[PDB]
RNA sequence: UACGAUGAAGAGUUUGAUCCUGGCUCAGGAUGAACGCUAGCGGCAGGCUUAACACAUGCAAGUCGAGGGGUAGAGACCGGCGCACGGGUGCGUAACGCGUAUGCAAUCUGCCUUUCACAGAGGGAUAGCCCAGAGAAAUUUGGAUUAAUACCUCAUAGUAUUAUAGAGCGGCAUCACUUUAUAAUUAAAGUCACAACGGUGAAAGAUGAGCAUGCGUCCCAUUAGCUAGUUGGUAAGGUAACGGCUUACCAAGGCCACGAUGGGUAGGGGUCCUGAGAGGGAGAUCCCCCACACUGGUACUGAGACACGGACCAGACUCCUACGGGAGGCAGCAGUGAGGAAUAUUGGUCAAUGGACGCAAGUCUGAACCAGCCAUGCCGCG
RNA sequence: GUAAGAAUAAGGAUCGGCUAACUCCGUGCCAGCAGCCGCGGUAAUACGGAGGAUCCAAGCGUUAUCCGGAAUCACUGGGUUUAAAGGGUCCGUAGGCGGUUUAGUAAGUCAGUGGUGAAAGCCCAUCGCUCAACGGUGGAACGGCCAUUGAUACUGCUGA
């Protein structure tokens, strides 16, 4: 295989059918002042039985595009 | 215009008339077929041979046909 | 000041407004004159400087200063403005090339011949 | 069809060619795949720097040499070595 | 281009005979001009000092400002003493070596003999005066113009010159402590870094 | 008393005179440069930055008789390949367009290379030509018609496709690779003899082409709400391929101060100039990617195009006309008019390299190699 | 390669200070010059001409657009009593920063390996054009990104 990309994030909202949206925070150094800045990005993952709720810590992996703006799936729910 | 330019507008017409004939002949069949199922698969495969219908798409149609006739 | 303040809003760099603006950022511009007259400096100089109202090819009305002595510069003449203001006439911010299409050069000039458009005797 | 051809890279008057494998639908001295050798017809021996470790590899992968390419790869080897099955 | 003018004037405007200590160096040694013969300006600026110290070397060899700046920034690529390598590459010129070998008693004659296919360098004839002689070159004289009238008429620590075959075997690149010249390279470096 | 680092200059000006803060200017480098004066060459490089304004004329993509009927004494036609390459421009685009790193278990792939199984019988047509026209031309209408490596039927062929049924291996969820039966369905071409060149199907490789994703992607917050197929799901239609790509139904979701939306500007990068460095300013010439071809839309042929020198339609210009109707697109090379301060020969050759066709000989190539003009820049000499 | 013949070939800018170079003649706040200070009202080193001098050189000056000087948007590398600059004062949201010890992970940080960072271009070294420009070869660089293996001193997270 090839071990497609994987991210770890926090569930932000569950208001859709069989789909969740999580937010991932990363600390990147500023290109000029060299100060580490917390930048956020929101992914859209795929859920089957609607198990995770807002405030959890999930781990998603990149797959084929299952829909528009939806190319991830939750596999490794860690904390609730 | 060129000499080679005044040959494609003449040969592509003879190709297009036959392509349209063979395309509509099987389009009408796949339309008013939805057992004589083993009669349009031949036409679909002949189109795939003539490179009209792209054997990939031809196999898509062949799979979609004999899945509801059951 | 603070690194956080700089990260939020960095240092603002100004644009350094140009000097010669009404010539479309070209070295020389052709133009037609409409009024050739004479003006006074501010102070304490005392002279009669020769200026001309030139309408450039891009639709700009400027005031050019005629260098040297000896010229025709009638009410309608094709001149070539190059730029370079003077600190005596308020408003004149351009110069006319001597030796251009229609403007005359100078006679009896021997030292600064590259300027004022004078041939070598 | 990937072909083994020559790319001119010298100066005006004195050419200097790179023996390189590239697609036929690309410009002469532009994009290529992998530089193979080097040809300098400025001395009497007509110097060459062929690489038989990749020449035969490209020939097996499906390269198609030209006249000058197959004449340079003739008296430098890899052709009597590509023939050996 | 070349200077092609009076050399006594150039010697007087610098106060140092660089074209041969001979006639006219004395006898009104003061700089030329109607205002140079009189009491010159006392206060001399450091910029004037550096500029004249550069022009002394720029006039002694016959180099233009363009080529001098090119040679300076070429020698400045060496991690060693910039002025030292500058003077070394300026001395390594072909016409300068021909002048030091005894032939062409002046550099103005060196850059008129070397530019006439009268001298050969390592076999093939080289008629370029700005030719940079690397350490270990063999300079000879063309056999056609070998028995000339001026060559035998006109005929160092690193040049091994042999008069029997017009040899000279340029080797052992000299140093500042060996090249005799009344010029300060640090001032030239400061002027070019100004 | 070592190591690496070859690198950092200021001045004038406010006051009767001083110090400090502070603004302006100059000393340096560089350019697709222009103007003035001046002017001898050689090598190399560069040359419409403005009107993507309008174009007179010449050339720029053809080739195969070893596919076919073969005519005059070659041409033209059917057929195969190419024309989607090369060449030009930067209009548009603030965006998975570009740079960077991957994935395709959601992909296709002519020509090329290596293997396996084969190239068996048949038929009706129609080009070209002939007989008559309708038209100023462009161009087009009737009749009978002769060939093909043109086209079309049946049998034949799988590590080919589909469906049902058993399996093994293996995951990264959807599932992936291989094997076994059964049923259905899909090929061929020969150049009178040899040589030589070919054709069909399956597998692998190479090359080329797509889709998705993480990060970096100008200014204005005197732009704070935006989106209604929009957000997610369930089934179909589909595309090479997953997918609101489209349709039918259910829910109200999705983005937004870490800058949505709106406006202005702009092709992006390797790079160029400058600077001690950190940075700053541009994206000519060389190379890679993207967009466009008078202004817009649409589809066919083809492996590959929604096609610069192909087609259809509409619009604005220019031309022919017998007034009924027609032909056009130099952002290709060389050139003309206009605009501008400003940028060149209506040149030579396929002799080298590359490209297309051909077994080859060979044909074409304003690609390319040379030559002319311009001190435009670098270097060298007098 | 051979034969007459120095014959066939040097100009532009500047000269009050910044900045390298000074004397005279003519005009008398006129004509004019000028990047800034600013010169000319009748003894002008600043205007025009002549002589001399300086720089560059087949080029020399002006203009237009950039970087440096400008520490003049300052992370490197500035300030806020009187020169421009502390909000009228508190509370507080988002955000920014975090007293001591200890256990765990290794996200930031550091080190190694593999892949990539096209070619061309800059720099270094070396060869061919008589040198150079130019061209060939090699290295360095491409400060970056992905996967993997280690260290746990400092920051982040969890527990005490």
From TrEMBL, chain A:
Part of the 30S ribosomal subunit. Gene3D superfamilies: Nucleic acid-binding proteins (2.40.50.140). NCBIfam families: PRK05610.1, uS17_bact. The keyword Ribonucleoprotein applies. GO terms for cellular component: cytosolic small ribosomal subunit. This is Small ribosomal subunit protein uS17. It comes from the Bacteria. Coiled coil: none annotated. Pfam families: Ribosomal_S17. Signal peptide: none annotated. One of its GO terms (molecular function) is structural constituent of ribosome. Belongs to the universal ribosomal protein uS17 family. GO terms for biological process: translation. Keywords: Ribonucleoprotein, Ribosomal protein, RNA-binding, rRNA-binding. It comes from Flavobacterium johnsoniae (Cytophaga johnsonae). InterPro entries: NA-bd_OB-fold, Ribosomal_uS17, Ribosomal_uS17_bact/chlr, Ribosomal_uS17_CS.
TrEMBL record, chain B:
It comes from Flavobacterium johnsoniae. Gene3D superfamilies: Ribosomal protein S20. This is Small ribosomal subunit protein bS20. Binds directly to 16S ribosomal RNA. GO terms for biological process: translation. It comes from the Bacteria. GO terms for molecular function: small ribosomal subunit rRNA binding; structural constituent of ribosome. Belongs to the bacterial ribosomal protein bS20 family. InterPro entries: Ribosomal_bS20, Ribosomal_bS20_sf. GO terms for cellular component: cytosol; small ribosomal subunit. Pfam families: Ribosomal_S20p (PF01649). Keywords: Ribonucleoprotein, Ribosomal protein, RNA-binding, rRNA-binding.
TrEMBL record, chain D:
Belongs to the bacterial ribosomal protein bS16 family. This is Small ribosomal subunit protein bS16. It comes from Flavobacterium johnsoniae (Cytophaga johnsonae). The chain holds residues 2 to 86 of 188 of the full protein.
TrEMBL record, chain E:
SMART domains: Ribosomal_S4 (SM01390), S4 (SM00363). GO terms for molecular function: rRNA binding; structural constituent of ribosome. InterPro entries: Ribosomal_uS4, Ribosomal_uS4_bac-type, Ribosomal_uS4_N, S4_RNA-bd, S4_RNA-bd_sf. Part of the 30S ribosomal subunit. Contacts protein S5. The interaction surface between S4 and S5 is involved in control of translational fidelity. Residues 2-91 form the Small ribosomal subunit protein uS4 N-terminal domain. This is Small ribosomal subunit protein uS4. With S5 and S12 plays an important role in translational accuracy. Keywords: Ribonucleoprotein, Ribosomal protein, RNA-binding, rRNA-binding. PANTHER family: 30S 40S RIBOSOMAL PROTEIN (PTHR11831), SMALL RIBOSOMAL SUBUNIT PROTEIN US4M (PTHR11831:SF4). Belongs to the universal ribosomal protein uS4 family. Residues 92-155 form the RNA-binding S4 domain. GO terms for biological process: ribosomal small subunit biogenesis; translation. It comes from the Bacteria.
